Amino acid sequence: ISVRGLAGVENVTELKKNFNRHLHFTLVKDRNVATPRDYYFALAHTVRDHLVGRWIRTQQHYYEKDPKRIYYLSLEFYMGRTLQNTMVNLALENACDEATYQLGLDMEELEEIEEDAGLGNGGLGRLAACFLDSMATLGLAAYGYGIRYEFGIFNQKICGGWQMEEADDWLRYGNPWEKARPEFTLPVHFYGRVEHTSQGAKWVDTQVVLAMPYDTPVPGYRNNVVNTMRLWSAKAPNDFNLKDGYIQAVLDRNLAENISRVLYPNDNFFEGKELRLKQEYFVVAATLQDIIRRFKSSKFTNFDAFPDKVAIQLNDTHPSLAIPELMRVLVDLERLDWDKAWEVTVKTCAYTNHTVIPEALERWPVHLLETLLPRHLQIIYEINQRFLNRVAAAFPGDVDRLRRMSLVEEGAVKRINMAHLCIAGSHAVNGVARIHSEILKKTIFKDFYELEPHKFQNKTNGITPRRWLVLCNPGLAEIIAERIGEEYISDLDQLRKLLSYVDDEAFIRDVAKVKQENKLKFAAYLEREYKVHINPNSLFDVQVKRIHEYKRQLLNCLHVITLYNRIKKEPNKFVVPRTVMIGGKAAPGYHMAKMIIKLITAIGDVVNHDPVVGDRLRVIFLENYRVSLAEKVIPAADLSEQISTAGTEASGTGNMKFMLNGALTIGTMDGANVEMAEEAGEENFFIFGMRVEDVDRLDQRGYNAQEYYDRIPELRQIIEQLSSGFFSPKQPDLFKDIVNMLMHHDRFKVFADYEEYVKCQERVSALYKNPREWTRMVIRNIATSGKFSSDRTIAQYAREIWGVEPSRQRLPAP
Amino acid sequence: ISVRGLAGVENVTELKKNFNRHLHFTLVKDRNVATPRDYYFALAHTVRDHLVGRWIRTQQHYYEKDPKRIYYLSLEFYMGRTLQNTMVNLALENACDEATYQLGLDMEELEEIEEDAGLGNGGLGRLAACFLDSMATLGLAAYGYGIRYEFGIFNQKICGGWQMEEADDWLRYGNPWEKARPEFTLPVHFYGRVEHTSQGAKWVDTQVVLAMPYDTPVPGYRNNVVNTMRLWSAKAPNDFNLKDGYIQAVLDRNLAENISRVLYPNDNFFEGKELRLKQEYFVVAATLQDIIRRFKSSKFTNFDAFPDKVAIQLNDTHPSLAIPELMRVLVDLERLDWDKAWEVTVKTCAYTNHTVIPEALERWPVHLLETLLPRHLQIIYEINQRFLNRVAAAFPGDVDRLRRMSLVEEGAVKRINMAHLCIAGSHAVNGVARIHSEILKKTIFKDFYELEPHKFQNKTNGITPRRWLVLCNPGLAEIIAERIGEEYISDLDQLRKLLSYVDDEAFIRDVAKVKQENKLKFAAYLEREYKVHINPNSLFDVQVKRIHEYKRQLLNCLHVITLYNRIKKEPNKFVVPRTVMIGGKAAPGYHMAKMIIKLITAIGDVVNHDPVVGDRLRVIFLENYRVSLAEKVIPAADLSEQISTAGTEASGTGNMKFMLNGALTIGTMDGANVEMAEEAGEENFFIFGMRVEDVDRLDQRGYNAQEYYDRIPELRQIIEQLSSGFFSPKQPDLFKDIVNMLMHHDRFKVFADYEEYVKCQERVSALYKNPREWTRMVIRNIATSGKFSSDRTIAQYAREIWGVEPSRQRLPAP
Ligand SMILES: O=c1[nH]cnc2c1ncn2[C@@H]1O[C@H](COP(=O)(O)O)[C@@H](O)[C@H]1O
Ligand SMILES: O=c1[nH]cnc2c1ncn2[C@@H]1O[C@H](COP(=O)(O)O)[C@@H](O)[C@H]1O
Ligand SMILES: *Cc1c(COP(=O)(O)O)cnc(C)c1O
Ligand SMILES: *Cc1c(COP(=O)(O)O)cnc(C)c1O
Ligand SMILES: Cn1c(=O)c2c(ncn2C)n(C)c1=O
Ligand SMILES: Cn1c(=O)c2c(ncn2C)n(C)c1=O
């Protein structure tokens, strides 16, 4: 059937009876009223059974051996479905497929019933999920810590071409993977005031909110290691939240519990709301108590060995309060002197930066911290004081450098620069792509780099080959395994061996066959769940990621309209057929992004119903783009669009997902695109547009969009089409904000890359016309994507930051 | 060990491995970190396993055979713990006791970890729970329908002698007995308006709240019948509750979900709050859709057979909206003519009245119904119109009778008398005790009784012998079974056979021994969990029920202070030692009731620390009185206090609980007290005080408390002690509200029954001094309590109201 494992005689039989056990005893149903949803749950419970045994020994093991523990703090964990991924990592896929088949059920049909765990916005949240899988696979004693939102990223609905948001009640039917642990509930404090008495400060008169943990298992790839992802849920105490109308007192509990109610749906954007700050401290305060408790047990109160036993990784600045919180505990509660406490804190903390755009930077108003976390503000001022004293001593008289490096920003309202806080309290700061890391040193954190050059590093992102290959593209994984075996699943570098089959006639035919099968399946799914046909013979041109101005979905739109206009000019001229698919969610308050989604659908309305165009060009907007949808489109894509303005996309990861699944990449020299082209050879990549230096040259000069409008008739024609209502008949001025922006305030110079972009697009169309060569280029990309596995990234974090050695050693059976 | 069943070899072994299965796979724990709470859950899950098989066949059976279905609607279900009760009804107690013993655990210690299901206030909610158990035991296709409050009756804490309320988070650790059924979620409407179009009215523009069901199994006594208790939970739709700030929209969902958040803690008191009205319609609207769906399937759309297949019992007026709601559905949706719809509604509905005190009567302001349920108000006006037309036609010219019987009350604000609505739309109205039922006919509902005498009936309350005897008093159940067998557990009348052992020397010794063992165990529990000693040789004088003015805990207080004053007058005179225990919760807004609790504790402060008193008199306030606590005190009581003012306690059930457990009763000729004395012989009962007629004579005359104050020096002395601060030194005027009330506005004439009350108390003290005779009187009470089993009550409801025949037939195994 494939290498989804063995369908053993004894195990298929065992599986079937447990499936029936759960359907009866757990679901309390009888075959005669059981629905597909019930069947999915019976299976989910049966599969979950297989890793509890391993889960218990893994955790017990870490308690015995007592290795250094890695704590990955993140406010987001974009997990997606977990049934199939668990079967894969446990080598249960074929056995379950068989058993369910014998029970007369279609496993694939049941897998589709599982709700996605959308506790993330995009890249940042998904990185965390891939990292967890890799840390488990590399046998690291790692813990994922976050918030258990009852509402994840909203579900996107398109109504009249506009995005409509609706609550993601992912817990509605229950979550068979999590295990509530009410017995480990912890208290978290808010507000109050600070008392300075005799021997130390005291945080007093605080409001208490309880943090209840929920553990979810994270199985490594076939090594019997099952790590833990602990997610905190807010609960109100039953005393003061009643003890300070009786009915009203009880109804008001849903005020303390609102803290873990919903994920903020902003991607690369900072909103200084108090509820967000509360979520950030909540996850930090609860998590740290757990970290210290575990340490106090260990084999040990000298906190001198704390950094030898603990490592906490900050996924962006969101969990940055962990620095002043670790100090508070050590100094206020444990009574360590400042200097000793600081040494410990810096040595256990490490920070990961994800972007350089200003609007994404967390700068919290002081009055907010002042009211909500009074003691933390005091600690931050003191950290700032001592840090600046270090700067002055290093750069005597550099008074401007002092104000520039301050953790405290003066002005309208004083704010705290969380990024500066993280650099100061961490022993390592890293970028997520080579170019992004360099930019950090040359620009944004230049002053900090000059002060402590040893702190700055790079750790190029990666994706897990398990979910992003074996799981979503079994067909491709099979033919690869037929030639080079299976060891590449946990050693992606081995994909290089595929280079020697680049001229192999059978392989070329096979690689091309699986991609064709994937396109047919997706084209079907399209009509199944969304309804309105596409042509599987055309080039699948797809751009899927969050809707942003910097990601330039607009630049993609300009190209689409150009293709359309050229066809209408010479209708009877042959052009390579294309189905361009654009998908992604816009943050609710991002007006421009929502305007762009309307533009996309507007273009599709015109293009898809023009008889002269026929099946040569289709514009489709992929609704509710999420992890589970990504697992479907990516394996079916031919062309991957990664066209952000050079210098704006820190790294990106979707690009990597496409490269590993047989799609060619048209993109700019941005983020990881650079290392990908470098790995496959620029000749097997479609690079275009300005490089970072060109962007800066243009900025010195000054960007004037009119110029491009004046010199390019094709561009001019498009803008006048938008301006006159060609794409919005009933509301002619509908897109005035887009045009206005493009012409007068384009921060991402869309027009500057237009000419080179369509020119480059012509080159891919030329290559698509030559199936054999297109496929050979594909093989060159796949065979060379090994570097982008999160196992490599994690192995680097482990050795260069955490001080731990990865291990591919199978844990002593289950 | 006892007749808790057989401890079979194969079954104890089977139990142990499943206990271990759940501890590992369900709880995900290992013996080395498992706590008693974990062990309780492993056992609970193991026991729950045994009734799912029976639960599924029972429900499947009803679907095949299709018998008349009984729907018991109640806003309260005071269930208490359910582990032991399930073992008992399944004959698993000894096997589980053995198995757990072999696993090295104490079953009793684990049973104490289970949280009470306190979804009730007192009598009304407990009646519903006892009824469910009896209906299951008598093999009726019955369903309990209510609301799944996440916060039940508050937990009472005494701070400085005052009651402190605190949220009852009974779901904190989970509920292993319930089964969420999200797939059967139903929509419920609120607000909106009414459109009258061509062919009928339409309820439009309504706000939708979803009702999610949770099923809990109700096992019959050893007959393999497991009925269902369906509890609705409020959930917000994910569309409009977002689709009409994005964050705020999501946080505001906890507005529609507040409907099932908390139980109103009022006992026999009406509060016209909108949230209450919402809870009442919510349970009614959701439940009826389920009833009709089930009917539409049946073996059948002629609703003529609806009453032959359905019976809905209204537990008080709380679910009264079921009448106009059934009409709305039949007329508005099914399109039946009014008259046909009304005939059907009246024939399937039946109403149970629980009290005659005005302050407990539900009279909803019209403006509230007008805004929240516009169509229901219209239907109620139309029902009223046609009903009054019936009255006028029966009593021509009786214009006053017309206004008196109206469902609509004029005045300050127009209101709807829910009780009148229930009488009009039901084919049977019943009281809960013979005297209460007569009073209804002679007083409160006299006009209605004259109009349709056939509607009025009586159904004397009862209690379940399983939980209220076998479960809480295994020692007594054992010695009874030793002489007459076990058939009495489901045939309590057989207790009469115990009359022939009334002179048996061994039995007298045994009955007295178990009571002594029960007192020792309770006296221990007291020091264990609450701490401060009592003497197990004294008379256990206990009054446990909700704190009320009509229940006269105050009359009990007067007696306690009298005993104290007599001892202080003649210290060296012998008096029978007593431990008087008073317990019960006061509704949060009931000032007087909270004042009474403070008085009780105040008396105990003086009495319990007076050296001259010694161990001859102890005053104890039983904290957090609830079902699980009742199962502890009652079996240990010698004297049961049921001293309400004649005519105010509809029936009472605690009185019955005490009679069955070997306690003697000192009470007034009120509620069921009358039938109890009638059953045991007034010579074996301590009756005192005014009878109903005496109370009325006094009212004609006019009640003047001064008189009693003037003629009784002992009474006078007590009042002056309260007035001068003898019981409240630091705050001398603390009890001025109690004294003021007692002297000027005592609606329950406490002083009128004082003299006869202490005189009667002297008689019980005299009898207690004669152990042999006290015990013989006890045997006369127990042997004669058979009539008060809920099996008798249910059998009567079944035959005289529902039209179904009970059956003690074992369902075809599990
Ligand atoms: O005091 C202890 N005795 C024995 N095992 C322990 C003890 N504390 C932790 N463990 C084991 O270590 C695992 C780790 O628990 P943690 O504290 O959540 O990391 C537990 O599930 C147990 O198997
Ligand atoms: O359409 C049907 N086919 C077969 N069994 C049914 C069907 N509807 C109900 N049942 C059975 O009847 C039980 C009663 O379900 P209820 O609708 O919740 O009362 C179900 O659990 C099934 O065993
Ligand atoms: C991988 C992934 C992302 C990140 O994509 P980029 O193109 O790097 O912005 C976002 N969303 C989902 C659902 C993903 O799978
Ligand atoms: C039986 C019971 C009641 C009813 O007692 P009465 O004396 O009839 O008022 C109230 N509360 C609980 C906990 C009960 O067990
Ligand atoms: C101006 N703006 C927003 O207003 C915004 C956003 N992301 C979310 N929002 C609300 N981004 C990226 C942005 O540039
Ligand atoms: C006056 N009053 C109340 O105010 C009250 C009550 N029960 C609850 N409350 C709040 N009762 C029985 C009562 O008589």
- Nearest CA of chain A to the CA of B48: how many Å? 9
- Class of residue A606 by CB neighbours under 10 A (exposed 0-12, middle 13-18, buried 19+): middle
Distance B78 CA to ligand 6 centre (A): 21
**Is A293 part of the contact surface with chain B (CB cutoff 8 Å)?**
no
- What CA–CA distance (Å, rounded) separates B623 from A237? 21
CA-based nearest residue in chain B for residue A260: B251
Residues paired with A665 in a beta bridge: A640
Q: Residue A543 is encoded by which pair of tokens?
A: 């751009």
Burial of A406 (0-12, 13-18, 19+ CB in 10 A): middle
C-alpha span between B483 and A672 (Å, rounded): 87
Mutation site, A215, A246, A257, A260, interface B, largest B CB count within 10 A: A246
Nearest ligand to the CA atom of A661: 3
Q: Is A25 close to B151, i.e. CB distance below 8 A?
A: no
Task: Determine if ligand 3 sits within 6 Å of the CB of residue A463.
Answer: no
Would you call A162 an interface residue with chain B, using a CB distance cutoff of 8 Å? Answer: no
B-facing residues of A in 425-484 (CB < 8 A) are none
Q: Ligand 4: distance of its center to the CA of B485 in Å?
A: 29
Experimental approach taken: X-ray
CB neighbours (10 Å) of residue B413? Answer: 12
Closest approach of chain A CAs to the CA of B243, in angstroms?
A: 7
Q: Which residue of A has its CA nearest to B169?
A: A238
Which residue out of A247, A254, A273 would a mutagenesis test of the B interface target, given it has the greatest number of B Cβ atoms within 10 Å? A247
DSSP run (H or E) holding A203: strand A201-204
In angstroms, the CA B110 to CA B114 distance is 8
Contact residues for B247 (Cβ-Cβ < 8 A; gap 6+): A262, A264, A273, A275
Given A30, A250, A589, which is nearest B151 (Cβ)?
Answer: A250
| B chain contacts of residue A60, beta-carbon cutoff 8 Å | 30
Q: Which atom of ligand 2 is nearest to the CA of B294?
A: 17
Distance from CA of B412 to the nearest CA of A (A): 26
> Which chain B residues have a beta carbon less than 8 Å from that of A52?
24-25, 28
CB-based burial of residue A484 (10 Å sphere; 0-12 exposed, 13-18 middle, 19+ buried)? middle
Instruction: Please state, in angstroms and rounded to a whole number, the distance separating the CA atoms of residues A705 and A752.
Output: 8
CB of B198 closer than 8 Å to CB of B218: no
Q: Catalytic one among A48, A54, A328, A551?
A: A551
DSSP, res A463: B
Distance (Å, whole) CA A152 – CA A168: 6
Residue B651: CB partners within 8 Å, gap ≥ 6?
B123, B431, B432, B433, B436, B460, B461, B671, B672
CA gap B537, B266 in Å, rounded: 37
Pick from B325, B329, B343, B317: which is nearest to B416 by CA?
B317
Residues A721, A714 contacting (CB under 8 angstroms): no
Residues 239-258 of A with CB under 8 A from B: 239, 241-243, 246-247, 250-251, 253-254, 258
User: Which of A596, A528, A521 is CA-nearest to residue A557?
Assistant: A596
Q: Is the CB of B298 under 6 A from ligand 2?
A: no
Contact A772, A508 (CB under 8 A): yes
- β partners of residue B189: B208
C-alpha closest to that of B75 among B126, B136, B133, B125: B125
The minimal CB distance from A60 to the residues B30, B166, B167 is found for B30
Q: Are A638 and A768 in contact (CB under 8 A)?
A: yes
| Token pair listed for B609 | 């620390």
For the record, the structure tokens of A45 come out as 């419970």
Distance, CA of B15 to CA of B50 (rounded, Å): 10
**Residue B659 CA from chain centroid, whole number:** 17
Q: Which of A121, A264, A266, A354 to mutate to test the pocket of ligand 5 (most atoms within 8 A of CB)?
A: A266
Is B56's CB within 8 Å of A238's CB?
Answer: no
Query: Which of B735, B747, B749 has its CA nearest to residue B707?
Result: B749
CB A96 within 8 A of CB A87: yes
In a 13 Å sphere around the CA of B54, the CA atoms on its Cβ side amount to 27
- In whole angstroms, what is the distance from residue A735 CA to residue A739 CA? 6
Cβ of B221 below 6 Å from ligand 6:
no
> Pick from A301, A628, A246: which is nearest to A468 by CA?
A628
Residues A122/A127/A132/A133 CA torsion (nearest 10 deg) = 90
CB B783 within 8 A of CB B49: no
Cβ-based contacts of B34 with chain A (< 8 Å): none
Nearest to residue A287, comparing CAs of A141, A433, A106, A75? A75
Q: Which atom of ligand 1 is nearest to the CA of B30?
A: 23
Query: Alpha-carbon distance A117 to A134, whole Å?
Result: 18
Among the partner-chain residues A49, A173, A242, the one whose CB lies closest to the CB of B165 is A242
Q: Among B443, B224, B271, which residue's Cα sits nearest to residue B365?
A: B271
User: How close A297 gets to chain B, by Cα (Å)?
Assistant: 14
- Under 8 Å CB pairs connecting chains A and B tally to 97
Q: What is the distance between the alpha carbons of residues B769 and B403, in angstroms, rounded to a whole number? A: 58
**Residue A616: which of A567, A654, A570, A582 has the closest Cα?**
A567
Whether A300 lines ligand 1, by a CB cut-off of 6 Å, is no
Distance CA B262, CA B153 (A): 8
**Nearest Cβ partner of B165 from A24, A164, A246?**
A246
Q: What is the DSSP letter of A396?
A: T
Catalytic residue chosen out of the listed positions A545, A578, A618, A626 = A545
CB of B232 closer than 8 Å to CB of B260: yes
Whether residue A297 is annotated as binding a ligand: the answer is: yes
Q: Tokens 């396109």 label which residue?
A: A519
B24-28, Cβ contacts within 8 angstroms, sequence gap of 24 or more: B24/A52, B24/A53, B24/A56, B25/A49, B25/A52, B28/A52, B28/A55, B28/A56, B28/A179
- Check if A772 is active-site: no
- Please provide residue A401's backbone torsions phi and psi, each rounded to the nearest 5 degrees: -65, -35
The structural domains of chain A, ordered by start, are 1-462+790-812 (3.40.50.2000), 463-789 (3.40.50.2000)
Catalytic site residues of B?
354, 545-546, 551, 653, 657
* Crossing angle of helices A36-65 and A93-102, rounded to 10°: 150
Which residues is B664 bridged to in the sheet? B639
Residue B297 is labelled as binding a ligand: yes
Asked if the C-beta of A39 comes within 8 angstroms of chain B's C-beta atoms, the answer is: no
